[PDB]
Amino acid sequence: SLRYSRHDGTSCVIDNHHLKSLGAVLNDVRRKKDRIREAEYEPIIDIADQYMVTEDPFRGPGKNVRITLFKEIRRVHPDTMKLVCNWSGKEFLRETWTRFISEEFPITTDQEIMDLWFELQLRPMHPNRCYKFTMQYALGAHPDYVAHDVIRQQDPYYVGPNNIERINLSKKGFAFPLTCLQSVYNDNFERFFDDVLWPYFYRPLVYVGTTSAEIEEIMIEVSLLFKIKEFAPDVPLFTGPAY
Amino acid sequence: SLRYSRHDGTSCVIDNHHLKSLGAVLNDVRRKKDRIREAEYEPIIDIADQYMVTEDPFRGPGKNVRITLFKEIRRVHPDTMKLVCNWSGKEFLRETWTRFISEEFPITTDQEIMDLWFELQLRPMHPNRCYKFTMQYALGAHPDYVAHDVIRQQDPYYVGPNNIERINLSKKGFAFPLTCLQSVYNDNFERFFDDVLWPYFYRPLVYVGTTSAEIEEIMIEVSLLFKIKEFAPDVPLFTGPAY
Amino acid sequence: SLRYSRHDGTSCVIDNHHLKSLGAVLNDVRRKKDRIREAEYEPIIDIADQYMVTEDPFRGPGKNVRITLFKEIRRVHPDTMKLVCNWSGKEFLRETWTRFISEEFPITTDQEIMDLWFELQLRPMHPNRCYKFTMQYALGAHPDYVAHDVIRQQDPYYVGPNNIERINLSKKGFAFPLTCLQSVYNDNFERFFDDVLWPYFYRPLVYVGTTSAEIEEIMIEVSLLFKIKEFAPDVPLFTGPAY
Amino acid sequence: SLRYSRHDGTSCVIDNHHLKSLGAVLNDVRRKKDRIREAEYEPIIDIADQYMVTEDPFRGPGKNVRITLFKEIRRVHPDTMKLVCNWSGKEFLRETWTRFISEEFPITTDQEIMDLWFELQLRPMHPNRCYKFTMQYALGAHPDYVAHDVIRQQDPYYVGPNNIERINLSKKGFAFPLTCLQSVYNDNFERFFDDVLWPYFYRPLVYVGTTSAEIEEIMIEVSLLFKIKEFAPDVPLFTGPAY
Amino acid sequence: SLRYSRHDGTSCVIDNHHLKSLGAVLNDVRRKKDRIREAEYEPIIDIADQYMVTEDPFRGPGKNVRITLFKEIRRVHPDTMKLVCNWSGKEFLRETWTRFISEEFPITTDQEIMDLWFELQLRPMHPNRCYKFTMQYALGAHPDYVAHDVIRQQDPYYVGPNNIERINLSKKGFAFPLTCLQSVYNDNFERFFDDVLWPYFYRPLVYVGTTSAEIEEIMIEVSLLFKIKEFAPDVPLFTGPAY
Amino acid sequence: SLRYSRHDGTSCVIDNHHLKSLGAVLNDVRRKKDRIREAEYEPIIDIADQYMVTEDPFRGPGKNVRITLFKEIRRVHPDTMKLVCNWSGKEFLRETWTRFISEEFPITTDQEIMDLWFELQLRPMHPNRCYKFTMQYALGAHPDYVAHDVIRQQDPYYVGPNNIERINLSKKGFAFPLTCLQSVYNDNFERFFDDVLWPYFYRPLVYVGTTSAEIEEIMIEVSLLFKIKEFAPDVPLFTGPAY
Amino acid sequence: SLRYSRHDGTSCVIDNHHLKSLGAVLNDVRRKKDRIREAEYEPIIDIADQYMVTEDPFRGPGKNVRITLFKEIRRVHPDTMKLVCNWSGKEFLRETWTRFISEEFPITTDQEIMDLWFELQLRPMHPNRCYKFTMQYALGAHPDYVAHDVIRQQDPYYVGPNNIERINLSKKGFAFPLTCLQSVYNDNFERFFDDVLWPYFYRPLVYVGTTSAEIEEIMIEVSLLFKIKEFAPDVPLFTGPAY
Amino acid sequence: SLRYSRHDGTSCVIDNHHLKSLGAVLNDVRRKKDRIREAEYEPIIDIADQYMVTEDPFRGPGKNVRITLFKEIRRVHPDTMKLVCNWSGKEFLRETWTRFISEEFPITTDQEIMDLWFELQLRPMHPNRCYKFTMQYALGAHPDYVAHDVIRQQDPYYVGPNNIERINLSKKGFAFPLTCLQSVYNDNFERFFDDVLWPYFYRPLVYVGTTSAEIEEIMIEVSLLFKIKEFAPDVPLFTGPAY
């Protein structure tokens, strides 16, 4: 915070003559100098404004709802990665539908699920170590294909600075409990499952490794992160009967 | 502009000896210093070149065709947003097809519609105010779902600096009068409508608010902005008969 | 002027994701850095705000009315100053009252004369010279005291950069045609003169010199500068009869 | 605050040899460099010391006693100003004498009123507005002159950054309850009024406007601010009888 | 001083070709760069030129005549101030008239006393102390009011850096031996005293303290400082008879 | 240009006290700082003033008279240069005398030809190329020596930044139509030619190439540039008879 | 060298949208800033471009041919210089003609000797010394004048940083084996000598000293340095017969 | 020195208002900025204050008494060092005791010899040389061991910038004429010698060389430097008898 906002100093009148605080006058001079510098670089900004950057989805619009799923420890050898989850498509749908619906009900407002993200969050199990986390994934395969429990690292994704990676699971492929802007209806998992076209094909298979030259022991927290926009009317909630 | 481009100074020869302008020689020295600095930071740029940014679609490739649709005034209470449009899917398609085709015909070149954007452009109705604009939207719902006229603000999109927001309406969902690279054929709205699979489901529902602590009065201009790439041959237009 | 005010760049939405112009984001970063610097120096400004400076009366409040009186040439020897005017108190009052009233009538608004200033404005009569102007003055004396036409310079006032000096003639001493906030009444010079208590005592005696080591030839323009504040009602002027 | 004042580091003696902290020695070196810079700019300060600035009267010597008088709301059209007060000279004296004497009694010390200031303090009645305040005033007029309630703005005083203007009411013109350095005597308003020579002539007439292009609603707090210097002896207060 | 003024270098002609010193040419280049910078900040100065500062009266126009009056030692307790002088109005006038007239006669030129200043000059009586001086004053009181010899400090004036304070004694209140621009006449103290209207009311009562937390011993030199402008004609002084 | 020259701000006098604009006072402070810096580097300039540079003859004294001679296109292979002109000494003298005399007559003032320069001016015949121009020359040879039309490049002169090279043809070698400071007499080419001692020996043979790795097509403009100083008396031209 | 020239980064297209490398975009921004700075200083360069400097003849056009002549050791006392060579004019011509012709034959191309330079190159004969070299010379004298072997130093030439001095021997005075642009003819020294007008008058007499306060021992290498421009046609050399 | 210490500017009082010099106010602002910077780096100094440096013993506490012993010239070959002194232990004690006692008597105060230092001071015997001095030493050996007069240099001590090296001779090993804090007694060399336990073992053997690649001739001054602290009472010296 500031002390005076930007209303520093004052003014008074003596014998028709007008006095103003010296520090405020010096700010006016310095602000004029800055205003001149703002105009000198405007054409430079116009060059930079040929391009755009993307707002962080998790700090940006929509609320975050973190449906944590499970925790797990793995020990990973150097230059390898270990599989984090090996659910079938049906088991992943059971967890997706069951954990979100039971956590969120009652859903009392119209809302739309903007995106579904698979969240991998990693932390060391020992102090005084120095290394970074890597990641690889796939999202679909023959239902009778069983993934290797451990693979060698090859051009992996490098996990970001806070040791979190979030992978978007697009509506193309992965089914949401709430498709569009809607109120909830009566629903159940069997209805949900039956209306998914390819329940057994899509399922996140995620691997985790490090950049260490020794074995490291890792704690993993896995979550589904829903981005949600609500459409709550500007009206009161009354006890029945109303009025 | 510059005065001399970068051809400052000159040269002459006196008694076999070659003279060159002092200012040009001082530029050669300064350019060598800069060249050395360019090489010192090259490895730093290589780090930055691990990442990429996205060209502004409206300043970038393709031409812009702004099909303005209507204007509207709303008064919006603090912490709320008011609905801008409430067309059914059919009415939105009538406006989309009718306004674009009638504005653009005759379409005399092969062309492709790259993208369709919904443009929301906002301006204050009073001077001496200080506040910013916010936005929320949805794109589909049950045809018998009628959107709330006013909602409370919750994690909205913050409209950009020039008080314009443009929302992409992807070919996935929203139907275009010209699908691919094509010449025009004979067409009409009934043919168009009949070949859209889900005419009644998709329709932009957009809300507008502010960051003000008082009621504000807003003027809204809504447009469809088409990005178009043309394929005009390098040939003459002659009066018939040719040659 | 600027090109974009401070509304540089824009924003758009693609697949729920929000893009903003890179140059605008870089300005937001730079403005945060400046905001931090503004807070670091606030305590320094608080020290400077212990003192105050005075607004230029001629660029400040009240309008200026320059009643030019006469012009005059003098040649001045080094280290001396020559007298500019030698009116008695009555002759100065005749010029003061006559020149202001005749120039300003009709005076159609309530108004107050804030201050009366004696303006000395000097310009060289030869090019390619380099020197500055000096000034000395007195404001009252025995009516039978006649001032020396030329004096030696001793600790004079150094005229300011634009070769103008303006000396305040305070209501204490010098009589104004309009004393307070008033409408005009029927008036004449004899009424005015008779109501001045000491008409013969007060009169500006002003001398002019230079900082040159040679004789210089100077053109002098002498004026009375009135500072006036008007109280014009917010009402129409109609042709009689009104309504 | 600081942590160590300027007594950083220490010293010890080993085998006749004297050790001192490295950071303190580096400060001694840096202070010598600064001392050298202080001497390089001394002649520059001597140039600046040809001029002087004025200490803020309200942060400077004498105590402040704010006798608030009343509050008021005005709505002011663009380019106009509205009258704040329209008291006669007698009514202004009644408020001046009554409010100060009743607030301050018992006055138990010798003291002098240094100055009397008319304080105008302004604040917006709506949030999210951006504009500044302007002021105009007069101090005397025919007692049967009634000021216009609203005037058009013409070269006004621009109120200072904190939205306060303070206008000096000099002893020349405006009468004080305590004239010089004195103890209080028995006094009353009738005695006070009778000894003022021109009670009906002097009275502050103050107008307020803005720099806005819309109507704005303003809250006004008006006060008399007395600057007072006390002469309290360095002696005890005892319960009677003393000693 | 400089060595070459600003006439560094030279020029010569060889075979029609003109050579100039390299250092002078480099100054011409640097001066052009500065000239460009002078124009970049001109608009900033125009902002600062909205305000004005006041020339030091003692370094400014008019000569200084320091009529020292007396010296005095006081010991002052912390948070208190001791009275410096306690003359009646008549005794102060005797010292003012007697000391100035006897010091200055013969007064051989026309002159005007611009201002009269009361000078308080303070110096420590012990070395190796660190503290500053404070001041408070009054200028008039009932003739039978006797000032307290010691008062507690309350919002005092902080003496300036050189341990001098000078208080203006205006013609309004305090009588001068020479009123306006005049030659001297035959005069004496009785004539002077009799023509002062209120001889017994006005008299400077000045107090001195410190910012020390211990008792300090102070040496005080008190003077009247006259600012004088002379009007000496540009004529010879001859031995009589002239010519 | 500047707005105020260096006469920014002003001064006025209030109650003997002298006010000056704050921006002007801040310039005085900054100029003192610069004056101090000017003296710190004076000894450095004295080192640079041990050497001298040469004024551009074409921007320097004497007027320029460009007698263009012809234009020509050449295509030049990489690492080669092509001959620009192959006149005998007599043909070069015919062009030199004929083109200058016919262009300049009537020559109505006393004047001296300071220098004669051969001007080679080059420009590309295609856009979007990047290369520089080179030059080689000789000035005399056996009259029956015929120069090679194309030579390989070997340590050539690199043409200056503006693609002009000017080669001095000294009076030693090359004959001028006007030898010294003179009025014109009756003259003709035969008289001129007969008085040249070695008409057939001296003749500029100039070659042009590039720094390109491809063939380039060049447009060449060749001129004689005369530097002339005139001695025109300060007298009127009258219609005959005079007076 | 650089790694990427100035082609850093790349571009790709995803869903009509265009991405470019961040480092390249940051270079574009920085280059725009530099371009703006280039235009700010252009007027400053125009001032510097009033003057010119001279290209180093030995790094500049024409090839260098160093005909070393002899080596010599001298011991030189402080403040003195010793003679380096004392040839008559004939002996200097024998060395000049004989050493150049025998070194350079066969001369197979048309060429011109641009300049002849006398090269003095000096090196210390002891390590761990610190001093500089000085030079003085003359170029002609009565043939029966014999130069002093040692002279006292008086305003000498200070040899340049690399301990080489090169003195131009102009065609005016000193005769060249090849006068103009020519092929070689049959020639011999007697023919050459007989056609020199003043063989016995011109001869370089050069002296060498130091800035040391002790005796120093110096090794001297003396050479004639010819600057030569060749005119080699762009044609093949074939074995006879050609074609 | 400075001109004003840090008491620049002054203050005065006009109409209750307090003026202070502008340059002093600008210093107050700049000092506040510096005070803020002092607090920003305090934590950095705390890091540096983890370590300590040692006061130069010769500029530090205790007085210096330089008992010069002898002078000597040596010529030293490259990469070698020559012996400076070859005294036995007894001869070194004779010089140490005899030279100090005879130089210093009468010793009239209580005092302690803090340290004894062997001083080697070197200077070149020729000008215009560039090289540095090296040193090696030993302090004890078998009395019948005779040191080599010249040794090859191997990892020597590099003499400091002023060409002085001072080697501490500790009380452990080397005997002092005054052991502790004492008055002098009657003493002689035989008493001194007899009470030294190992007179023949300890003796400084010092060698000197250079970093030159040539022979150099060196002048050597060798001294014993005593550091002494005196305990002189604060009492008068009277002529006997006292009082």
Side-chain angles (χ1 to χ4, degrees), chain A residues 1-170 173-243:
Chain A
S1 288
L2 270 51
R3 290 290 160 97
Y4 307 140
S5 307
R6 310 152 199 190
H7 300 84
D8 313 51
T10 186
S11 62
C12 65
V13 182
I14 302 173
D15 293 339
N16 297 321
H17 308 312
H18 204 201
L19 285 71
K20 180 169 175 183
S21 309
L22 172 65
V25 170
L26 292 178
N27 276 349
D28 295 344
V29 170
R30 199 236 301 154
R31 302 222 168 88
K32 182 68 170 191
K33 177 193 153 190
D34 292 341
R35 280 280 97 202
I36 293 177
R37 171 168 128 109
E38 184 99 343
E40 180 182 9
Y41 306 159
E42 207 185 17
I44 301 167
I45 297 301
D46 220 6
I47 299 302
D49 274 350
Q50 190 62 26
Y51 299 93
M52 304 182 110
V53 292
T54 307
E55 190 166 3
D56 183 313
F58 320 105
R59 297 173 47 153
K63 69 178 182 177
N64 305 310
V65 176
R66 186 185 175 186
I67 305 296
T68 319
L69 292 188
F70 60 89
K71 305 181 68 149
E72 172 186 329
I73 301 161
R74 288 295 221 164
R75 301 200 175 105
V76 184
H77 293 187
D79 195 48
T80 71
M81 326 183 82
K82 278 194 183 180
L83 183 69
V84 166
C85 46
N86 212 15
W87 34 33
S88 77
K90 179 170 192 171
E91 183 69 349
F92 172 74
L93 281 173
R94 186 180 69 76
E95 288 301 326
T96 301
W97 185 91
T98 305
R99 307 290 287 274
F100 171 88
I101 293 298
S102 64
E103 180 65 16
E104 285 286 81
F105 255 73
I107 303 174
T108 55
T109 52
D110 300 347
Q111 64 193 249
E112 182 176 343
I113 293 166
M114 297 163 63
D115 281 291
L116 172 65
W117 298 83
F118 182 101
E119 180 181 302
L120 182 73
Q121 189 274 332
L122 317 160
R123 71 192 81 194
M125 296 268 301
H126 293 102
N128 294 88
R129 312 293 176 98
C130 287
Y131 62 84
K132 294 296 210 204
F133 293 103
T134 50
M135 182 278 289
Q136 187 54 273
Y137 73 98
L139 299 175
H142 195 285
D144 286 294
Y145 175 94
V146 177
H148 301 285
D149 205 64
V150 60
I151 58 167
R152 279 267 164 180
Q153 290 198 41
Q154 167 259 329
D155 300 292
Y157 290 79
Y158 288 82
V159 177
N162 68 342
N163 302 328
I164 291 173
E165 193 65 81
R166 300 185 168 106
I167 300 159
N168 193 88
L169 308 179
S170 69
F174 290 90
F176 297 2
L178 303 181
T179 45
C180 54
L181 172 59
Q182 63 173 106
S183 165
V184 296
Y185 308 105
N186 280 329
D187 214 350
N188 54 80
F189 174 64
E190 289 72 43
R191 204 292 310 171
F192 175 74
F193 183 85
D194 282 356
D195 279 330
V196 177
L197 183 62
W198 287 105
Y200 282 102
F201 180 86
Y202 294 103
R203 51 205 199 266
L205 304 173
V206 179
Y207 292 86
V208 61
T210 71
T211 57
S212 182
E214 61 177 0
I215 295 193
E216 308 285 2
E217 193 175 315
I218 308 172
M219 171 62 71
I220 312 165
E221 283 193 344
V222 166
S223 309
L224 302 172
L225 197 163
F226 294 73
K227 290 298 296 197
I228 291 171
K229 45 188 181 183
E230 285 184 80
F231 298 76
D234 185 38
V235 305
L237 176 70
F238 286 124
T239 296
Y243 298 106

Side-chain angles (χ1 to χ4, degrees), chain E residues 3-4 6 16 18-20 22-24 30-31 35 38 42 46 49 51-53 55 114, chain F residues 3-4 6 16 18-24 30-31 35 38 42 46 49 51-53 55 114:
Chain E
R3 290 290 160 97
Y4 307 140
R6 310 152 199 190
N16 297 321
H18 204 201
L19 285 71
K20 180 169 175 183
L22 172 65
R30 199 236 301 154
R31 302 222 168 88
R35 280 280 97 202
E38 184 99 343
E42 207 185 17
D46 220 6
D49 274 350
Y51 299 93
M52 304 182 110
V53 292
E55 190 166 3
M114 297 163 63
Chain F
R3 290 290 160 97
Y4 307 140
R6 310 152 199 190
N16 297 321
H18 204 201
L19 285 71
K20 180 169 175 183
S21 309
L22 172 66
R30 199 236 301 154
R31 302 222 168 88
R35 280 280 97 202
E38 184 99 343
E42 207 185 17
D46 220 6
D49 274 350
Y51 299 93
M52 304 182 110
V53 292
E55 190 166 3
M114 297 163 63

Side-chain angles (χ1 to χ4, degrees), chain B residues 100-164:
Chain B
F100 171 88
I101 293 298
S102 64
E103 180 65 16
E104 285 286 81
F105 255 73
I107 303 174
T108 55
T109 52
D110 300 347
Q111 64 193 249
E112 182 176 343
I113 293 166
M114 297 163 63
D115 281 291
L116 172 65
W117 298 83
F118 182 101
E119 180 181 302
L120 182 73
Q121 189 274 332
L122 317 160
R123 71 192 81 194
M125 296 268 301
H126 293 102
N128 294 88
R129 312 293 176 98
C130 287
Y131 62 84
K132 294 296 210 204
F133 293 103
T134 50
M135 182 278 289
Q136 187 54 273
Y137 73 98
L139 299 175
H142 195 285
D144 286 294
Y145 175 94
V146 177
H148 301 285
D149 205 64
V150 60
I151 58 167
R152 279 267 164 180
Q153 290 198 41
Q154 167 259 329
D155 300 292
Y157 290 79
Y158 288 82
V159 177
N162 68 342
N163 302 328
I164 291 173

